[PDB]
């Protein structure tokens with residue numbers, strides 16, 4: 001057994017040299033396409049709420065303003081008929097939602113993970129850490145265990161289960177991955193964000209209009225990333241360096257976004273002022289992430305590339321307006337919101353994927369739209385803001 | 396010290412990525428520098444537990460099941476446990492004291508605000524021992540298997556403690572009995588990769604989430620209820636200890652999580668409309684013991700250290716999942732009866748507090764070592780291992796190096 005003076009030598013040999021870097025992104029979504037134009041019809045019919053004409057017209061108007069074109073779900077109308085309790089408002093339904101989400105979320109997550117590992121190109125044996133993230137379903141052994149099992153990873157992979165961290169969770173996984181990759185030499189972190197929104201699905205209510213609004217936004221999906229420090233030249237494809245990661249709680253805003261896991265499943269509560277809380281405090285979070293690493297915040301926010309969580313169209317609009325951004329800055333975010341909706345934690349991974357793919361296709365200078373520095377933002381319950389400062393690398 | 400204000404650790408003036416990384420990372424090993432513990436006020440002695448539990452759950456009529464449970468309680472080697480409820484509190488909730496009546500909502504109403512509250516009590520004690528301002532805590536790792544909510548238990552704990560708005564929070568939900576090891580694993584990378592970082596680890600459990608009436612066809616559930624107790628353990632972990640201010644005790648050298656193949660059905664816990672349903676197979680002590688040595692060999696070899704020929708050369712903080720788990724791990728590793736003393740003392744005075752148990756044992760070990768005037772906080776020994784065991788089967792192996800007194 002080594003001496004007291006040898007402990008530091010072990011630490012020096014154990015830690016990685018460089019910055020945690022995104023080197024692969026894979027995405028997945030369930031097969032059932034739900035176009036937004038017909039969502040009011042489908043939702044009200046599936047939930048047997050066709051008698052509520054006044055609420056349907058109001059919900060249809062909200063759907064037309066969401067700027068979501070389609071969403072994907074692990075269910076169709078036929079599947080929902082087998083679960084009348086899920087399609088009701090307050091009937092006991094957690095058991096059924098758990099029965100679907102507990103095995104379904106890691107299954108969907110694994111699909112995205114497979115695509116990320118395939119792009120990465122290295123053996124799955126080289127994955128040392130697994131960060132699994134979901135707000136849909138909880139179990140013991142957890143979703144991380146299930147994902148590692150389905151992928152057939154090594155028995156000693158260090159796993160991290162990020163349960164119920166909502167819409168900011170896509171930022172949280174980057175924060176986790178940063179420390180895991182950077183503090184461990186040779187470590188390759190598989191990040192998986194997967195969501196099956198059937199956990200939040202229920203019938204519409206007049207007094208609880210904000211729940212229906214959440215159901216008009218949320219879609220299913222999974223995003224997976226391979227993150228590691230010290231990229232192997234000629235083997236790995238380094239894209240985004242995770243330079244600084246900070247989580248911020250906006251004070252006195254707990255009552256804004258609330259989600260409770262009850263006997264009726266996940267109950268969603270949203271105040272009408274959520275886009276305002278996020279937009280008015282986002283700049284302070286950005287100034288903080290830059291100053292934490294000694295970089296002077298840019299005079300023009302258009303100088304950075306952006307991966308904001310598409311919590312809703314109003315969140316994107318108000319953040320864009322407050323940061324004085326040109327319409328093309330949130331192009332990747334708006335394309336994802338349109339094509340897939342709000343996939344909770346999986347959304348930012350989809351945007352980062354869209355950004356690097358379009359940058360590589362257009363032949364730009366870097367993976368981050370030709371720009372050097374950028375920010376990945378997660379927004380959710382708290383109100384919590386996850387600010388991830390990224391430095392993109394050349395093609 | 397971290398040397399946050401020193402020139403050698405200063406941030407680069409230009410936006411140099413590697414320069415930022417060099418300045419941002421810590422130098423040394425993540426070190427435990429404070430341990431605070433808390434428990435709810437209601438004492439439930441084990442010698443009368445069979446009587447209290449069967450009466451509180453309207454099951455005293457099942458005579459043969461009571462005689463079987465009284466035998467299990469005598470073999471647990473638990474003397475007393477603490478709970479946030481007494482018999483009077485349980486009468487307000489006949490659904491929790493039943494076997495399968497809808498009860499999750501009531502359990503959530505108790506556990507969602509109760510777990511962070513209990514955790515905060517332990518955290519206040521850890522912060523007081525540490526002696527530095529609470530605003531200097533940069534990371535919060537909250538851990539619980541009792542209650543889930545959005546915003547999570549970590550948020551609530553941070554709010555109750557009055558931590559900085561920019562504290563990096565980690566919520567370890569439903570990682571069970573291995574979670575006390577998981578928090579050390581999280582804290583290690585968080586403290587070591589961030590200069591000046593001071594990680595507050597909080598493990599808090601309110602087992603009322605698992606409480607229900609005994610059943611003849613589900614005897615393994617009652618066995619878990621005879622083991623589980625409430626409690627909280629909080630630790631302050633950080634790299635590069637400030638000499639003269641901080642008290643460096645245990646260095647977290649290597650942390651690895653291992654899954655034992657083909658053992659998923661051994662320990663299962665499902666969160667249902669009836670709360671947390673506990674399932675346990677008879678083969679848990681044997682399976683853990685038959686695979687523990689491989690986990691220890693892995694943790695040692697991962698840092699280039701040759702595994703010791705005699706496991707008695709190390710100090711031990713094993714999760715007291717049950718007396719049989721402790722007995723079989725002790726036997727397999729050919730350990731002397733006193734190596735697991737600290738673990739057995741905590742099991743006796745507090746029972747199995749899920750994730751909080753190992754924190755309590757680490758506290759018991761360092762306190763008794765200091766009280767006896769020993770060489771180090773780890774029973775006078777230099778190297779040791781903290782072990783977490785739970786659903787999977789998952790083993791958390793935490794290699795520790797204890798510093799001198």
Ligand SMILES: CC(C)(COP(=O)(O)OP(=O)(O)OC[C@H]1O[C@@H](n2cnc3c(N)ncnc32)[C@H](O)[C@@H]1OP(=O)(O)O)[C@@H](O)C(=O)NCCC(=O)NCCS
Pocket residue numbers: 061062065066067167209210213217257270271272273274275311312313314315380
């Ligand atoms: C839902 C959304 C797409 C509608 O777009 P919009 O441009 O604001 O539309 P409108 O202003 O015409 O408003 C639609 C109606 O909904 C109302 N509304 C919006 N959000 C609401 C909420 N959370 N609760 C109750 N009513 C709400 C308005 O009050 C309005 O009705 P009114 O005329 O009866 O007062 C937009 O508000 C949004 O993007 N919200 C973000 C929600 C969010 O925060 N998601 C993430 C948290 S997980």
Ligand SMILES: CC(C)(COP(=O)(O)OP(=O)(O)OC[C@H]1O[C@@H](n2cnc3c(N)ncnc32)[C@H](O)[C@@H]1OP(=O)(O)O)[C@@H](O)C(=O)NCCC(=O)NCCS
Pocket residue numbers: 466467470471472572614615618622662675676677678679680716717718719720785
């Ligand atoms: C419960 C415990 C303290 C009892 O000590 P013990 O020395 O094994 O006692 P005994 O052998 O006299 O056993 C009591 C009765 O329980 C039975 N039993 C033990 N574990 C059981 C289980 N998981 N399920 C069903 N029966 C079980 C025996 O089968 C025995 O009865 P039987 O002769 O009628 O078949 C011990 O088994 C233990 O420590 N188990 C570890 C529990 C654990 O795993 N905790 C962590 C999971 S989070």
